[PDB]
Design a protein around this nucleic acid. Sequence first.
DNA 1: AAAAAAAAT
DNA 2: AAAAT
Lengths: 594, 597
Amino acid sequence: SMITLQHQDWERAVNMIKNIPPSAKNKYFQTFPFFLLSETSWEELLSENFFYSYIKSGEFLTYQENLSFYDRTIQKSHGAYRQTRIVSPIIYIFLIAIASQVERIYVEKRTNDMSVYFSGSFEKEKNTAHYKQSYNTYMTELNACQEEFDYYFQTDFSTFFHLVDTDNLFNKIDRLDPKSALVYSSLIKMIGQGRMPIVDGNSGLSFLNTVVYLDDFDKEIIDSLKTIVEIESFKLVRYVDDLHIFIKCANKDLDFLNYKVYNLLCEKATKHHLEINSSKTKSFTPTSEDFEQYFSKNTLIEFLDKLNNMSVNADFSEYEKEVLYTLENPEIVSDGSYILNAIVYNKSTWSQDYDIKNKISLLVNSNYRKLRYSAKALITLVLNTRDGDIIKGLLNNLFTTFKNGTNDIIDEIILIEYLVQRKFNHKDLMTILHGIKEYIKAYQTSDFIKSLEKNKVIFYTNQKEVYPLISKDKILNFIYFRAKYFESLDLVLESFAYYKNYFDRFVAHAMFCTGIDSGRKPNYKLYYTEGKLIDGLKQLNFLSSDEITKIINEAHKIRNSNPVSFSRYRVKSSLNDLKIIIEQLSTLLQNKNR
Amino acid sequence: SMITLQHQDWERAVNMIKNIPPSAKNKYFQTFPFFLLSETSWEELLSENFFYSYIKSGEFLTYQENLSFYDRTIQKHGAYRQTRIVSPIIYIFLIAIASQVERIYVEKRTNDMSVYFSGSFEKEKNTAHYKQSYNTYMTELNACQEEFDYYFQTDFSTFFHLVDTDNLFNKIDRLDPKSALVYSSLIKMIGQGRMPIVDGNSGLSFLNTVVYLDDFDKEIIDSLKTIVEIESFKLVRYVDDLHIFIKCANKDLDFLNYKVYNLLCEKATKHHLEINSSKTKSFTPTSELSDFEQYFSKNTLIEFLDKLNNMSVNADFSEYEKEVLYTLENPEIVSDGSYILNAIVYNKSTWSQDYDIKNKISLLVNSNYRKLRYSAKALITLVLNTRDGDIIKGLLNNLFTTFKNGTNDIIDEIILIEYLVQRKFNHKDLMTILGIKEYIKAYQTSDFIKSLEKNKVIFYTNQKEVYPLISKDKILNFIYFRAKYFESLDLVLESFAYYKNYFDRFVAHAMFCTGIDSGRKPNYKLYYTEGKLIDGLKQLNFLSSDEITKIINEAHKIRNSNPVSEDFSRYRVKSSLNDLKIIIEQLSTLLQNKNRL
DNA sequence: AAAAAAAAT
DNA sequence: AAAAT
Ligand SMILES: [Mg+2]
């Protein structure tokens, strides 16, 4: 009733993550907690008992573990900062479940003149939350368009996710229930502190931003391209924000087509609040544009030498020009980054050469900061040496900088990349363990389904019987979620209005628990007035009658002046008073004795 | 008081706009309305009665003229800046918001830094134009050149569109949360949910530069002081543009470039700022910072118009800048042809009247006027500098042909609006040409203060007297403003809940106004429920008695299931809001009828 | 050199 | 298994 999500969507979401090969779940930070999941813990996820009582009831949006998010900076391919947000494993499923419901009820506007792919696939019998299957199919079609058509146009959007209007995204889904779209958009915006976050690899946000949000824009490009008579045929292929425009035309019309198509892209992008990446956009280009023999171990030695002699103050431009180009073989068709990844993932024994392992040791001990140019590949290169003195040396060099206080964001990314590749080893964690450190201790060492059932609160009535009405309340769970949603954005007016409703209803629940109100269902409406609140709270024998009248009278003075239904400090002070009462009214209920 | 804005803040906002020179007022779209304002209209804007009865009461947020915003694309490297055109009253309010913030905000940055924005709040130099601050900014850049050794330039990409308006107003500690709600929601209403770009507005320029960037700017100041290789440093800022002047030894330049640049990238990411990489240059020596007919002549302009006419319209901005704009450059002066072209159209107006020059300009506007899109503002001035009727009217006729044929695109709109602004909205051109055009008719043609009072709704009671309680209702006005704010964002649940509250209070006023309800104040509380609300609408005898029952029944059905107060879709909610809106239109029309019943 | 103004954002 | 946005 509150979330229109069906169990089939949550099931689909859980199945896409489970379908990821176990040898792939533990290569990423965000998918590692699912790698530690037992088979019995999986069965609980797809079980409808866990869905209707914890997911659909909104109970999961009432625990601080599911409303807490963390910052994590990852490295861009060419040396930029991609700021991401880390969410709890439960929230990671919910984002995919939302996309599962949207895929069922959204009617696409783009025609079959264009193929679309994202970091996932809802294709039947091939559901997966990973990018390999979709990206491989994406690159296979780019080759098909490479042979069929003559020229291609490539465009891209800058800061795509951060410029997405989350409210506008959910508004273009007609058959989406507005009461449910309010819950979805609030959670997503809460992850991004008001804007569309970057949950790296999350197919939920990938599908929503590529298939739904870009639908209107892609449709106008398709329709306008048909009016151009100079184009014989065309085909569009898109991966998230990357777009390829293959066409068939005469060479004599290439100039006018470049003028027509580029102005068509700019006009429509500005129309839909999209910013075209001028750097990553090229004009109409012709479609044409033993491994130990192409790249030997000597070519790898020159890489470490040019890198070990390069100063640590060199930017990415100096690293990519000298060091990375050393790997490119004239006869081979690959960049310096692609060849480097092929060595660490296939020629793993090369790091055990006497010369290579020694040149590697010089890198880690001289300055580990040189690892920042390719953190994933270079750390794998270090770990491929299989030498404990080097592996423990890189960790201790990181530990010394974190011990002093000079640890910036570069020391962080190297540390997190190191801890993920070593599978969050217990000995490494005992030496390191703030912010992201809390998520590592919380979900990266245990089964979060087993820890979910242990840390569950339980209320006991006067007859020492379990009270299950609070957690199953589809009104209390969502009013509390909205009160926390506005609190994270520091919007104290709307946050007080919602929490005051949660306060009156939770008080009405503690009455049915102690047997004071002995009706069919709890009397929620009775405690909306001031006279019934301070009288019932005093009847609970858990607070002083002088303080109770001091808090609710002040809180009533705020509700009668709240323009949502007096400084931020005054509102936050009365809200903190309402929270302390709840924390004591809660601890009073779990005590079966008296 | 639903906004804590003071009269001094509004007075300041109107003064800095008035302080703009007239010959600069008539140069921009947003400020041209004020160029037509009579002196009595200026007196009214500063008058105490106008502020308390129209601004601080929220009455201005209940007229469609102040809640209607239109898109407009201005020219950048040949990119698109999507702007949002606001009403003249709204243009002042954003500036008045900045005035209250300037009085109560405490800057965290120190005097190691100099911050400028598009305007000024200086004691004796209040101005809403950018020429004053930009000249002071250019002067400080020259002083910093003569004293420091190297400078580091930085810039933010999509700076305005990446700002979080809610977080911005949250760094203003002394701003009350209730006024911050109105200020934030109105700004987000203009930008359709995000921070907009109102062309040249000092109010948004001040907030995003002085307040939003404060946390980032102080972090750089504190971190630069810890670098022992930096002897001294001074920081200069203009909106998002930033210069880091330092004094140091040449031997530490490599370490300082790596230290300063990475610190910039780290803290910018921390505050959700996207650093522009194309405009960020490393530590460059200060010496590299940027009689007329002796260098540039009429022949230089003849060579410019020649290559422009030989270049095909299919050419892009790079081919224009490299092949055409280069002919204006001189190998003795460091200057882009853009700055040279601006000097010719603005200081050599008579050059466009030369015989040879005027013929190639006519050839430029008769072959394909879409070649003007490369330098829309400058090349239009070049055409208007010819003072030729057949040439200037020829450009208007070609634009009218592409608009009558229905084949006009965004490029033709940019040339058309810039042409209409540069020709000062000529009467003959307006009759030939005519959403953005509606703003032209409503504001760019006459005194908008005089038109404001001639189009004010007047409500008559049953005794044929004026009913003045609706306009002065601070509660009704702001509730209506929130309903139209959520409606603009297409958020049906919040828009219905606020409009229903506005609907209940408006009917309560119509009940007192028509004499059905007696006493001192209208009985607002009695019309909050289904039953009494239907009876009051039946009593007025202006709608079908059955349709009132169906509309209110469905309206209260939606209210009882609204989670912000299933089977309720977006369409169903929007239909009930429309029926509620339709009833108000009939109720309002009936109220401005003196001799009725 | 002046529709003492446009050109920066 | 990693190497994509
Ligand atoms: Mg609300």
